Amino acid sequence: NTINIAKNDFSDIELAAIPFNTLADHYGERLAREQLALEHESYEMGEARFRKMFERQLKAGEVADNAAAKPLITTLLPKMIARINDWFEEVKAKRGKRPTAFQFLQEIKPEAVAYITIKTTLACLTSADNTTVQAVASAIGRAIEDEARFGRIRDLEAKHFKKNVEEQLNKRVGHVYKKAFMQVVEADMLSKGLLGGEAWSSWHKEDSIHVGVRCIEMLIESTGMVSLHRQNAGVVGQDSETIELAPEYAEAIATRAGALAGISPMFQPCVVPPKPWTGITGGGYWANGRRPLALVRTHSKKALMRYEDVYMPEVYKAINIAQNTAWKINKKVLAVANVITKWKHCPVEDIPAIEALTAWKRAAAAVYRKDKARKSRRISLEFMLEQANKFANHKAIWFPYNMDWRGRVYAVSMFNPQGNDMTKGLLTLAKGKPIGKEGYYWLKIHGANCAGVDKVPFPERIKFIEENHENIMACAKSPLENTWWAEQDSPFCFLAFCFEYAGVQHHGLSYNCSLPLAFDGSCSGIQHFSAMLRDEVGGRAVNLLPSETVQDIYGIVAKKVNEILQADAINGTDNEVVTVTDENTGEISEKVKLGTKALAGQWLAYGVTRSVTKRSVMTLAYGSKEFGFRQQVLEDTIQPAIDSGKGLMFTQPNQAAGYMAKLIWESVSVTVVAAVEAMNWLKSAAKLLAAEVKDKKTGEILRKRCAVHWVTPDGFPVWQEYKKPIQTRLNLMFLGQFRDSEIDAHKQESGIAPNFVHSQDGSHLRKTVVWAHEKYGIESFALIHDSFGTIPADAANLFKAVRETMVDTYESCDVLADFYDQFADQLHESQLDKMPALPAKGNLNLRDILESDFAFA
DNA sequence: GGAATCGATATCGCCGC
RNA sequence: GCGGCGAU
DNA sequence: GTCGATTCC
Ligand SMILES: Nc1ncnc2c1ncn2[C@@H]1O[C@H](COP(=O)(O)CP(=O)(O)OP(=O)(O)O)[C@@H](O)[C@H]1O
Ligand SMILES: [Mg+2]
Ligand SMILES: [Mg+2]
Structure with a gap:
């Protein structure tokens, strides 16, 4: 019974009455009325998100492994471990045969027991009907038993042997198998390792109930989480004492879960260019959702603040420039997927083309995963292809962009440009240019990349394209009748193109073409390093x-x-x-x-x-x-x-x-x-x-x-x-x-x-966005960390802008050294010697970059 | 010093038990 | 947290 | 299960 947030809360982001006349004015009543009802959905899609996940959390008792219930167990476990610690001094300081539970509970770390109870408690309490302290107590013990038994393995016997264990342990999921694992480990541990007995076979189901009951007692003692009341006292087959969650604490949860479900937004894209970034926050989306976007995606709130007052316009423009890019759904491409995915788990997976144990169970493991994915992978497909279907008739859609703590720009929404083939193939740019004899020299090049030819000289790549001109055309004529696209190292994109390459043929170079040609670097990594050190x-x-x-x-x-x-x-x-x-x-x-x-x-x-x-x-x-x-x-x-x-x-x-x-x-x-x-x-x-x-x-x-x-x-x-x-x-x-x-x-x-x-490649890309924006009229980009794209037309330029933006940055500075000056005066006196010198440079002449056909960017 | 332990692929995201 | 997926 | 490099005896 979670506090439905879907009330005055999401209502907050009012799509008809908010200071939004800003958007209205700028883009209109409809789009501004849209952008807000969308954003609103995002959250509505976020709440729902939380509920269904929380549904199966209760429905399996895992309601303790839920951030909605973790704040209680933080003040609830100190009260409970203390009371069991006084109780161990209460019977130790008193002769006479020690209680039935106290002989056992002297084996499992008290803190452990403490918790073990809390959890399985709330777990059974969230069951359908059975809540009796009979089955309940039975459960608690059952478990505590396991931990003194197999926890001895992790304590003395496998002190280090545990290494070989842990591994296959975590890999093991679900209480059952994990036990399946520890019993077989035990049977081989005493079979070689440390020797002894198994004094847990004497643990009668009675002993089990005993444990599980004295605990619960400790529980209602130290805390009031649960009130122990009588159910219909005065009946022979009804008078059963049972447990109930303190209505107060139940509200804590229902409430914590409530407010939680409201900060997990499903980020969609925008109907109107994003709201430029003024700084730190407030950026991207327009509404004032209870989940603002940070300029930078960081871990600790303080770490984000360290930016607040920092200056860096080069950066603020990049985000903003790049974020302004307008894209549209590739309506043609989509009605292709709209067919083949409804006839195949993976539109492009299987198309009709022309040491004994440790191995037999090796491939067996395979056959398992290989089907895990095939079903997770389709879970993501069904998503895209849906999003895609929402915004197919939209004139043009936009993506907000944050950054990671180290620089790298990312889009915000879920469905974004930085997708996978299929994803990227539904996404083409909204404003086009007519192509031109040089603009098409690059359509074609791309087409070569999308099919896998890319480690052979550009004419070659063009040779390729031309040798297969008929094919391509085929595909674009009728996509469903031909699978040659499909077999292509990047099908859905490579077919993006085939519908462009046949637009050219039907309209000659005067073809308006918005498709993202992208220039991917070799190994950004080594590149930068090799440049920042002139290593030829x-x-x-x-x-x-x-x-x-x-x-x-x-x-x-x-x-x-x-x-x-x-x-x-x-x-x-x-x-x-x-x-x-x-x-x-x-x-x-x-x-x-x-x-x-x-x-x-x-x-x-x-x-x-x-x-x-x-x-x-x-x-x-x-x-x-x-x-x-x-x-x-x-x-x-x-x-x-x-x-x-x-x-x-x-x-x-x-x-x-x-x-x-x-x-x-x-x-x-x-x-x-x-x-x-x-x-x-x-x-x-x-x-x-x-x-x-x-x-x-x-x-x-x-x-x-x-x-x-x-x-x-x-x-x-x-x-x-x-x-x-x-x-x-x-x-x-x-x-x-x-x-x-x-x-x-x-x-x-x-x-x-x-x-x-x-962070470096970071700078570099943010710069090319800028550079090639200001210097050359390019206003439409495709950004993938180390991959820059633009329309056929501004393409020619990009290609150079990068090789430009690059050599600028490495010529003008030496981040390595710059980096020295940064910490230098922070190395204590004593370590001034363990700090090796900046490796010598090389004979590379950055300016060469400018003529490297293949280091695209 | 010397014997005892951790550790070995980076950041973002989604999904799931 | 472990698992899988996908992006560079 | 190599290489080592940092911790506690
Ligand atoms: N060990 C690893 N761990 C995580 N990600 C990895 C990885 N090895 C590779 N990758 C990722 O897997 C991708 C491999 O794609 P490929 O198409 O095989 C590489 P490529 O750089 O285009 O060279 P290629 O044409 O020789 O295949 C890369 O984008 C990279 O980010
Ligand atoms: Mg490749
Ligand atoms: Mg990579």
């Missing part, structure tokens, strides 16, 4: 330097690795049988340690190509180094290998993947040395600044833990402040939640590298 080797790689042949970072590190293989294939170490005794069993074993010489043999035997290197290198920007590739190598190619038929050669999977790692790791830390250096330098910087330098002779705080802060080239300032709570409260099979804060130096030193590049 590296830039070459991401195509910072112009070339005739599209350079492919993966393909080249592939290379550098095949070169090491063959070098070990001839020299290198030989095998080696080393003895490995198990940590749990103490059993002796024989394991031959494949040597470089052979490992390679295999590698070579398998067939190393771009595809064995991609992921590792493409994530190299987020941190992964030598260690993290193993896992990747192994599962991204070694496993699916064996599990595919090939893989024979993979005698020691782990060893083959331990090795390939290092190879990769050596082959990239020489191709993008830049990225390597810049990242590590940065990583140092943050470590230091994270540290809590003291004197271990006073154990005195010399310079507390410093966060990290810098300012992007376009005026944006980023604040890397990762906080870790000092709490804790792990539970086994039920929950295990909440119980001040401090900077978590690890998170801190981790997230610098990525974040920094990530």
Whole structure:
């Protein structure tokens, strides 16, 4: 019984009587009457959102795992753990055989029990009918039992062995299986590890009821959450004492849930250009919803305020400029999806084209997930395709844009430009230009990108387009009769285009064409680093330097690795049988340690190509180094290998993947040395600044833990402040939640590298939005972090504006150093030496960028 | 110092138990 | 919180 | 299960 918010609350955002004459005037009565009734819906779609989710929270008893009920259990668990702590001193300070519950409740951490009760309590209390203290008490015990039993595993026996457990534990969902897991763990733990009995088999259902009853007692004692009243006293088959939730506390919830359901808005797009950003907040949507948009998406309220008075117009315009872009539904494209999705889970998934256990149960696991997604993935489809259907007859729709704490612009709504193929393919720009002989040279280029040809020179890409002109046309003539679009690396977009490419043919270059051609960078990551350090080797790689042949970072590190293989294939170490005794069993074993010489043999035997290197290198920007590739190598190619038929050669999977790692790791830390250096330098910087330098002779705080802060080239300032709570409260099979804060130096030193590049690309895009807006009449953009698009016509320009906006930023500054000046005077006296120097620069000439056909942006 | 522990892919979003 | 999805 | 790097004895 939740306080329906859908009253005077949402009523707030009045779509007919509010100071909205501002919009009316500016766009009209209808659109301004629309924008507000929409926004209003968003919330109405937000409340509903909350209810149905809250419905199944009660309907499974998980009403404790709901933010609506978590504020009570915060003042409710201190009262209850204290009373059980006095009660343990009440019978300990009194001779005579100790109560039935007290023998057991002396095994499970009291705090735990304390909670265990609260939860399963409210859970059964929200059941259909059965609330009797009989079944109730039975439940509580049932559970507490489990925790003293399997919590001993996590306490002494698997002190470290638990590592191998935790993992498969969390992965296990639902009370049942989690138990299924812990019993089988127990049966093998005493079968090898620590020995003893199982003094829980003596725990009769009686013992269980006993526990579950003395607790509840403690519960109505310490608190009044539940009043223990008699149900029809004076009857033999009706007089049963039962539990009821204190009407007061029930209101707390119904109320907390009420106000909650009103801050989860379903952000739609706008009917009228968004409300420019004046600062910090109030931006994007127009109404004054009980959920304003922040300029920046941040975690802590204070962190957002640090912006309030900051100056940065370069930035405020970017958002605003970019946010003004008008788009429209691709009415043609949509009636294609409107057909094929109603005849297929995935319009483009299947179209008629021309180690025993640990493996059989390996693929079995597959077949499970692969169907999880196929159903989650359609859950998102059904959404888009709906949104899309709402706004198909609208003349033009707009998207508000925030930023993440590090810069990056995002749209606000759910259905947005930064979608997936299908998504992006329903979205084309509202104002067009006529195309022109140069505007169409780019339609076509795009068309080449959308079909997968993009690592071959632009004429080529055009060759392609032209060789298949008939096809394309086919598709655009009749889309449903031809699946050639579909099979294309980006179908729904690539078919976006085919309807344009046939508009050209029917109207010659005078064709008004609003479709977003987009210029994607190579690996923004390495790029920036390689520029901010003039690394010609590296830039070459991401195509910072112009070339005739599209350079492919993966393909080249592939290379550098095949070169090491063959070098070990001839020299290198030989095998080696080393003895490995198990940590749990103490059993002796024989394991031959494949040597470089052979490992390679295999590698070579398998067939190393771009595809064995991609992921590792493409994530190299987020941190992964030598260690993290193993896992990747192994599962991204070694496993699916064996599990595919090939893989024979993979005698020691782990060893083959331990090795390939290092190879990769050596082959990239020489191709993008830049990225390597810049990242590590940065990583140092943050470590230091994270540290809590003291004197271990006073154990005195010399310079507390410093966060990290810098300012992007376009005026944006980023604040890397990762906080870790000092709490804790792990539970086994039920929950295990909440119980001040401090900077978590690890998170801190981790997230610098990525974040920094990530705020940087940030600046860069915000600038090209501006630059190419002011300097060239371009007023219509497609923004995807590292992907800029515009209409066929302004296209020619964009392409250059970027290669421009870029070289400007790297020429004019050295964020690396600038970044120094930022913390420099914050490094305590003592650490002034552990801070390595800014790596030397290179011989790259940024100005080359301006002529790199392939480093689009 | 030396032996004992955490940790290893970044930010945004949606959905779900 | 874990799971999955999707965006770079 | 390698590499190491930071913590407490
Ligand atoms: N290990 C990883 N973890 C998370 N996201 C990853 C990832 N590896 C790749 N991705 C994402 O997956 C996407 C891969 O798309 P692809 O089309 O395979 C890459 P690409 O950069 O166009 O090169 P390609 O043409 O060689 O495929 C990237 O957009 C990236 O953001
Ligand atoms: Mg690609
Ligand atoms: Mg990526």
